[PDB]
Amino acid sequence: AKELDATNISIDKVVGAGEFGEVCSGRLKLPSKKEISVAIKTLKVGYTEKQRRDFLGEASIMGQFDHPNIIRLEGVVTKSKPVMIVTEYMENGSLDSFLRKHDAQFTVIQLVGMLRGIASGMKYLSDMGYVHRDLAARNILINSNLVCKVSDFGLSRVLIPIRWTSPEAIAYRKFTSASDVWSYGIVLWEVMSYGERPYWEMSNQDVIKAVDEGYRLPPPMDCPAALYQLMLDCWQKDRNNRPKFEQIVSILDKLIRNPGSLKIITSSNLLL
Numbered sequence: 001a002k003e004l005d006a007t008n009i010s011i012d013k014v015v016g017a018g019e020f021g022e023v024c025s026g027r028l029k030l031p032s033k034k035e036i037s038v039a040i041k042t043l044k045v046g047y048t049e050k051q052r053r054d055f056l057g058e059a060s061i062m063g064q065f066d067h068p069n070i071i072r073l074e075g076v077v078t079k080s081k082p083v084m085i086v087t088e089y090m091e092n093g094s095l096d097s098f099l100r101k102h103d104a105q106f107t108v109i110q111l112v113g114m115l116r117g118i119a120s121g122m123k124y125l126s127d128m129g130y131v132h133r134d135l136a137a138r139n140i141l142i143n144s145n146l147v148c149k150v151s152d153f154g155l156s157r158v159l160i161p162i163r164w165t166s167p168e169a170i171a172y173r174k175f176t177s178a179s180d181v182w183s184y185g186i187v188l189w190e191v192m193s194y195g196e197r198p199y200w201e202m203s204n205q206d207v208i209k210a211v212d213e214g215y216r217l218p219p220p221m222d223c224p225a226a227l228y229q230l231m232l233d234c235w236q237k238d239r240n241n242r243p244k245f246e247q248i249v250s251i252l253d254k255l256i257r258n259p260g261s262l263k264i265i266t267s268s269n270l271l272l
């Protein structure tokens, strides 16, 4: 990861608190002198060596990916204190919270664009050999232009959130890119539901058993039939029958091609 000079970093405001310390926003002056807005995470004073290792370790994973749909790592500060992780600024925050403020306020085509971005980032992540294992709307960040990018590599592994996890990964810990596709189906439900919680407050034992029995989340209100079927396809019990991320991107691109296909609508509790 690129070591940044702290003289090029200015902290504007403290957005909130993270696991290892403060989450801030600010500006980064690039070597060319151009200035960009950035997110800045600071490791808390008095950190343990393991905290430093886990903090920077997650930046190291994020830094493997250069893609428009994956949060960009501008760099780290390890040679002065506080230790810092600097990433691209995403004005509208986490996708689930952003959509909850907006219920029913976006067009279907806007929502599909958000979903296409997420799928494109996952296509690259899975091309690179990584299984995210955490894919959820809370782990997607959304910028001022509504571009959605994958974040939160804490659980990412080179080749547990029950509500987002495929039946086989719950059962035996079988985590593949196809279990990420399952999670993507959950994200698709979250987006089309404007940030409703998957399976609401159901007991986790009942989430596990209901899905195993063949029950699935019901179609969000006014959900296009193409998009609900895509959820069900991501939710296939047999992981080999789920679409690949490249196929998901293709499916969403064609829906964007003609918006008229989105006008066909599907016609709470889980459906068998």
Ligand SMILES: [Cl-]
Pocket: 003, 004, 005, 006, 008
């Ligand atoms: Cl620098």
Ligand SMILES: [Cl-]
Pocket: 160, 161, 162, 163, 164
């Ligand atoms: Cl959960």
